[PDB]
Amino acid sequence: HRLGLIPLQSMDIEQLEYSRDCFCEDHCDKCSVVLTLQAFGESESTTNVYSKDLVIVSNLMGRNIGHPIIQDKEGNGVLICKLRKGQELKLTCVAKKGIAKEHAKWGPAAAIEFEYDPWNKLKHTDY
Amino acid sequence: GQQYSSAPLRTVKEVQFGLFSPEEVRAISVAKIRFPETMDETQTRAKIGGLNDPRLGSIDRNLKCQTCQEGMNECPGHFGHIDLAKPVFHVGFIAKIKKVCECVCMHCGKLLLDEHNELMRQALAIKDSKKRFAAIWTLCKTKMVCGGCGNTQPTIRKDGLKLVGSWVLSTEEILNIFKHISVKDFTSLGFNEVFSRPEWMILTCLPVPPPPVRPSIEDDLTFKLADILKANISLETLEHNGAPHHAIEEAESLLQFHVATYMDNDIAGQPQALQKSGRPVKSIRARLKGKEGRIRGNLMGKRVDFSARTVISGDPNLELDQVGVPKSIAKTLTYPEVVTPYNIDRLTQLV
Amino acid sequence: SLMSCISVGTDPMPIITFLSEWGMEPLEDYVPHQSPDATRVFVNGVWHGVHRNPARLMETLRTLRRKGDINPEVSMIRDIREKELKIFTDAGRVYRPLFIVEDDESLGHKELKVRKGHIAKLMATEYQDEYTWSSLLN
Amino acid sequence: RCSFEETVEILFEAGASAELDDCRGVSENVILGQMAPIGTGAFDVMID
Amino acid sequence: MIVPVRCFSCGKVVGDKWESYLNLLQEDELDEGTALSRLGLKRYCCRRMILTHVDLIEKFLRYNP
Amino acid sequence: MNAPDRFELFLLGEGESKLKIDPDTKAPNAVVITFEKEDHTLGNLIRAELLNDRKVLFAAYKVEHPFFARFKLRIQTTEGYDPKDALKNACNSIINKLGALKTNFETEWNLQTL
Amino acid sequence: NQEDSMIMNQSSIDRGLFRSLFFRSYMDQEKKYGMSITETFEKPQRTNTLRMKHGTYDKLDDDGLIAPGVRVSGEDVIIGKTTPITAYHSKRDASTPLRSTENGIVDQVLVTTNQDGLKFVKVRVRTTKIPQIGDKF
Amino acid sequence: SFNQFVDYTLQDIICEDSTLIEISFGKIYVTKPMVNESDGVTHALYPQEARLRNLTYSSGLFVDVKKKVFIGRLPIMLRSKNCYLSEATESDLYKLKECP
Amino acid sequence: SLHKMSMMAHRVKVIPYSTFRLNLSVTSPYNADFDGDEMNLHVPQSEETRAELSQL
Amino acid sequence: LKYICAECSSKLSLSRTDAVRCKDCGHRILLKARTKRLVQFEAR
Amino acid sequence: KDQDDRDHFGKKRLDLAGPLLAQLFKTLFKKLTKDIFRYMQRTLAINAKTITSGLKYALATGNWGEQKKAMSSRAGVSQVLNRYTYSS
Amino acid sequence: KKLMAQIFFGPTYYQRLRHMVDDKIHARARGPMQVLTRQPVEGRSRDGGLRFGEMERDCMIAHGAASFLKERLMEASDAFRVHICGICGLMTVIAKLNHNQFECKGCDNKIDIYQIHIPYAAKLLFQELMAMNITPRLYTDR
RNA sequence: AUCGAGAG
DNA sequence: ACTCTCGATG
Ligand SMILES: Nc1ncnc2c1ncn2[C@@H]1O[C@H](COP(=O)(O)CP(=O)(O)OP(=O)(O)O)[C@@H](O)[C@H]1O
Ligand SMILES: [Mg+2]
Ligand SMILES: [Mg+2]
Ligand SMILES: [Zn+2]
Ligand SMILES: [Zn+2]
Ligand SMILES: [Zn+2]
Ligand SMILES: [Zn+2]
Ligand SMILES: [Zn+2]
Ligand SMILES: [Zn+2]
C-alpha cells in the first residue's frame, strides 16, 4: 500500500504508455517501470528502509521517469519500513501509468487553494 | 418434485380429533417391538427385529423400505406398536380420568343422578360437550352413595402417577370400570362413540413412532422407548418368574413412570428423568410447545428459500417503490420463467 | 469504577480480642435497664456486647487503621443516633480510596492531611522511575 | 387455539372430546399449507 | 504501526517528515506546534496526520521471531 | 465484494458509445445527449458555455446517479440552429480559452523566480 | 447521509483511512482411538477418499496443509485430514474448507503436538478490509 | 482475590475440613505452572506456549499425608504470585512473546 | 413486522455495492434508519403470487 | 517439506513421521515456511 | 424506622475468582477424600484427575458446580476474554 | 460555487465498528435442508434460509395475499405429498407406487385412497400426535 | 442440544 | 410472556 503511495518521477510520463493500451503481455519497458527493493537488518540498531533504497531495474531508455522523489533534507525520502536484527524484506515493484481518478496514489497535486470574491459582493454566502 | 400417484389430489376439509383405541393401534402397526436393541446386533450394521425395524423405515440411503420401496425420500412413516405388561395412565389425561371416576361410581358404571333429579335434568340439557361435562362434574362429585349397586363411592385424590381411595386404585381396575360405562353414558359427558372412549384414555398398548420422527446422526425418543421396553421386559421377567409382592409393583410404577415421561417431561413430579449426558431429555410435549415448538416454530412460521438479508442504506436517486439490490444477491436469488414465444430469445440469451 | 476494589477478607479475631481488652462488656454480662445508652458493638453481623464511651474506642480503631495495625480494608461504622458500632471484615465488600480531612491544623481550619510536599515526593518517585501509594495509605 | 399459549393440552382435550375442525380458520390452513379463505382465497374461480 | 506515507485528507507526503519531527522535539527542544510548522505542515489535516500518529512499530520490533 | 471496478469511471465498456444523441419528445427543436464515462468536470463547463450562446434557449446537465460515471445534457436552440452546432461552438470556445490560458500562464511563469 | 448514515472521502480511503487487518485461525486435530486408529494429515485424491469437498485441494502440500503466502478464496480447502473407517474408497474425508463468504491470504501455519501427543494444526489466514459502503462507524 | 485464595484459602480447605479414619493432611504446596507431556518429560509452561498448544496454564498441588502426594492441578491466574509473568520485567515479557 | 406496511412490494433495481438501498420516504412505514439496520427480501416464484405482490 | 521453529532461528526439514520437536531447542512449537510461488499485490 | 433498602450496595457482596474457586475446590476435594475413603475401605492410588478435570471443566464451560445441570450458575461464570480492543 | 450556509468543519475522533456489510450480507435460493423438519437450515454460515416469522404471516394476512402465504409455506420451504385413507383418515397408507398398490392394514382399503399436499412439519405434527395416542383424522369432504 | 456475547 | 450475528462446551 505505502509502496503504491510513493511519489515517483512522472516528467516524461506522457511518452510512457498505459499497460492496458500496450500490445505486450502484462507489462514491458514501453508501459511500465520496474524497480527492486532489497533490505536486510545488519546492525544491532533498527535498520530503516526508505524510498531511496528503491533501485530502478527496467530500461528507462532516455525517459526521465521512475525515480522516487526525495524532498527529504537528509536525502532519505519516505520511511517505508523498519527492520530489527535479522529481518529481511525482498520484493519487486512494477509501476504503471495511472489516473488519480482510479486511485489517489496517482495524485499529482495535494491541496488546491481556491477562493473568489473575498468580500461576498456577489452574496453567494449568507454569513 | 416427487412422483406420479394414481390417487386423486384432494384438499383437507375436516379434522376429526380422537383417541387411539388399542385395537386400532395393533391393527395399524406393521411391526411388533420385542427387542430394546436399536440397530447393531452382535457387530452387524443392520436392524434387529425389535426396535427400528426396516419395516418401520430403512435408514441407510437405500432403495428399499418395507417392500413398498420408494427409497426414504418418498416413503413417510410406518407406525409400529408395543404391548405393555400392564395398562398405564396417559399423563395428559390424568386429570380428566380422575374426573370421570368422580362422575361414575365404582364397580357398577352408572351416572349418580338421572332424569329423576331436578338439577341433573338441567346439567344434561347442555349441548356443548365441555360445558356439559363441567356442569355435571360439579354436581356429581358430592355424591357418596348411589340401576342399583349401592356402593359408597370413595374419595379419590392424585398421588404421583397412581390414584387412591378413601372409604389405592389399580390401573387395571379403572380400565375395567371405564370398560363398563357403555355408550349412553358417554354422550352425557362429552365423549364420542367410535372416536374417543374413556376405555382408550388408559394405555393398553402404545404405538411406536417411525425413524422419520426420531432420526440418528441416536435420538432421545429412541432412548426413552428403550427405557419403556426395558421396564416392560423387566416387569414381565418379574411376573413370569419369581414374583414378590413389594417388588413387581415398583416395576409397574416404573413402566408407568417411563411411559408417562415419554410424552410429558415437565410434570409436578420432581423426577424429570434425566439422561446419560445429564440432559433433562426432550419429551414429545416439549417438541410442540412454543415458541421454538413445532407449531409456532415450524408451522406458523418457518425458514424459506428465495430470501435475502442485508444492511440498508438511503438513496435520493431511487423511486419510492424501488429497492437497491446488490448484484451478488441478484445472481443468487432466482425466478422460474416458462419458455414462451414472447421471451424465448431473451431467456436463451440469459442461459 | 476506576478506583473501586473488592475486599480480600481478613481475620476478625484480633479485632475481637482488642475490643474485649478495651472496655467492651461481654454480651452474656449485659443488663439493659442499668445501661440503656450503651452502644452495642457488631462484628461481621455478630453482637459481641455493648460498650460505653464509644468515641474513644472509635478514634482508637480509626487511628489503628490509618496507621496500619488494623487492615485498611476492614470497614468501621459508628452509628451515633442508633447507638451502634458495626465492624466488617467481610470479603466481597466494594470500597474506594478517599482523602482524609482532619481539623488538626492549628494555624488554619479543616484541611486535607495530604500536602504539596507529599505530592512533590510522589512526582519525585514518578520522575525517578520510594514514596508510593502504600506510603500514603500508611 | 393450539397455535397460541397452551398448545399441547388443547390438543389433548380436543382429542378426548373428539372435536371437529372446520378448517376455515387462518392458522389451520397455515398448518395444512393450503390456500386459506383470506382475501384472494375468499372465493373460487371457475370457467364459463 | 508506522508513520503514514501521505496525508489522508489532502494527499501531502508526510512519511518523510517523521524522524525529522522527532528531532525537532528532542534535539532543538521545541514544542509540537512549532516542530510541525517548520516541517511545512500548515494545514491542520497533515498537522494532525503527524501529531496524532503513534509509532507502534518500535514496540513491534521488540520481538525476536 | 460488489464494488465495481475503478476504471469503469473513465474507461468505456463493451459497446458503450461516448455520446448518445436522443431527440427530445417534450419541446420541439430540443435534444438530450448522454455523456458516458464523464462527470461534473465536463458537464458543468459545457453547460455554462452553452448559456453564453444567445441563440440557445435551454441548456442543462445532470448526473442521475453518483454510482455511475455518466451525465445527461439537454439542449434547446432557436429554429434554424442545430443544437449539435451549439455544442461544437461551445466546445471549440472552451478549447480556445484553455489554450490562451495555457499560453498566458506559461508567459507569466517564465518571468518568475525561486 | 440522511437517517444516521455518512459520506466518506474515497480519496482519503485510498490513502489508508480506516483500513484494517483481519486474521482468522482454523484449528484441527488428528483423532485417536483405543485400537490405535488415527486420523492422518495428508492431501487425499478423489479415488481414495469418500464424500470429499466441492472445493479444490490443489493448494495443499504433501503434509495436507497450505504454505503461508498462497492466496485462498471461496470454498478452498485449508486443512486436509482423512479418517479410516482390499476395498476401494478406504477413507472418509475430514478436510476443513475456507469460509464460504470470506477470502484472503494464508498468513501463518502452526503445527504442534497436543498434551496427549496428538498432531494438531492452527492455520491463520489474513485479509485486509477496506471501508466499503455499508460499514458501521 | 486469587492470591488470597492461593496463600490462605486453599490450606484452610484442605486442613480444616478433611480427616479420615487414619490419614491426616498437612501443608499444601503450589508449584509453578508445568506440563507433563506425552513424551513423559515434565517441564515449565509459559502462557504463550499454553495458548498456542491449547494447553492449560495450571500448577500442581502437593499435600503432606500422615498416618508428598499429588492431588491435582490448579489453573493459575496470569500475573499472579504463582505466575512467571509477575516477577518478569518488560524485556522478559518481550522475550516470552507476551505483550507488556 | 408490527403492521402491514412492514412488508411492502418493491421494484428491483440491480446496483453495485453490498447494501439494500431504499428511498428516504419509505423509512417511516418500516421504521428504519441506516445506523446498521438490516432488512429482508423475499422473491415470488409464480405469476399469480407476483401478481398478488404487485396488485396488493 | 520444511518447517521453522518459533522461539529460535532454525530451519528444520523434517517431513511426516517426525514432527515435534526441534533441533537443539526443546520446544514443540513449529511454524511452516513461506511458499516459493510468489504472490502479487495490487499496490492500492 | 422505615423499611430496609434491599438495593443498598453496601449490604451486597461481589464474589471474585477467590470465593468461587474456593467453593469449587471444596466440593472437588471433599469428593476426592470421599473417593479416597472408598478406596481405603476397599482394602497411594489417589485419583488426581478429579480436581484437575473438575476445575478445567468449570473454567471452560462456565458452568460452576461440576457436571450437574441443576446449577443456577449456568449464566456463564467464566467467559472467553474479549480481545477486540484493549479497552474491551 | 460557494455554499450559502457555512459548515461546522473540523477534526473529530471517529472509530470503526466491527459490523461490516460483507460479513452480514446473505442470500439463498434453494439450499441445504434440515433432516427432522426438512426445512432450510439455520445460519448464514451454513447457507441457510430466513425465517418467515409469525408477524410476517400476519402482515401477509393483513394484505390479503393468500397465494403468497401458501407459497412461502410450501414451495419456498417444506412441501410434502402424503397419502390418506378414506376410512380412518390417517397416514396408515402403504402406498406401493409404480405398482399402484395402495394398501391399508387396519381398514382393508385398496381403492378408496387419497393424496394431499401438506408441509412436512405438519406431517411431523400429525405423526407425533399419533405416537402420543391421538388421531388427527384428515377427511377431504364437508 | 444447551449456554454466553452482540446487532437493529 | 420480533428477527438476526457470532462464539463456546458436551
Ligand atoms: N426487542 C425489540 N423488539 C423490537 N424492536 C427492537 C427491540 N429492540 C430494539 N428494537 C429496535 O431497535 C430500534 C432502536 O433504535 P433507536 O436508535 O433506539 C430509536 P431513536 O434514536 O430514539 O429515534 P430517532 O431515530 O427518531 O432519533 C427501535 O426502534 C426498535 O425498533
Ligand atoms: Mg432514526
Ligand atoms: Mg436503527
Ligand atoms: Zn507494455
Ligand atoms: Zn416404507
Ligand atoms: Zn353403583
Ligand atoms: Zn492534509
Ligand atoms: Zn528450536
Ligand atoms: Zn384406514
Side-chain angles (χ1 to χ4, degrees), chain L residues 44-45 50-51 55:
Chain L
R44 185 186 90 97
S45 54
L50 304 175
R51 188 178 190 272
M55 294 180 172

Side-chain angles (χ1 to χ4, degrees), chain K residues 9-59:
Chain K
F9 198 69
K11 297 178 180 58
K12 295 184 178 302
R13 301 299 187 268
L14 301 190
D15 290 328
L16 270 300
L20 295 172
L21 284 178
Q23 164 187 342
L24 188 60
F25 190 88
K26 180 186 297 182
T27 298
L28 297 180
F29 181 76
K30 200 171 188 61
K31 191 267 189 63
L32 176 58
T33 185
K34 187 69 174 301
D35 204 328
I36 289 309
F37 181 83
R38 286 189 175 92
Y39 171 77
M40 184 198 65
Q41 72 178 1
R42 180 173 299 112
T43 299
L44 181 60
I46 298 185
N47 184 264
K49 193 180 181 300
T50 297
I51 294 184
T52 299
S53 62
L55 295 175
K56 285 184 59 180
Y57 175 85
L59 262 301

Side-chain angles (χ1 to χ4, degrees), chain B residues 105-106 108 146 148-151:
Chain B
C105 180
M106 304 303 300
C108 62
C146 300
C149 192
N151 197 336

Side-chain angles (χ1 to χ4, degrees), chain G residues 3-4, chain I residues 31 33 35:
Chain G
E3 293 286 353
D4 294 275
Chain I
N31 185 20
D33 28 26
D35 60 335

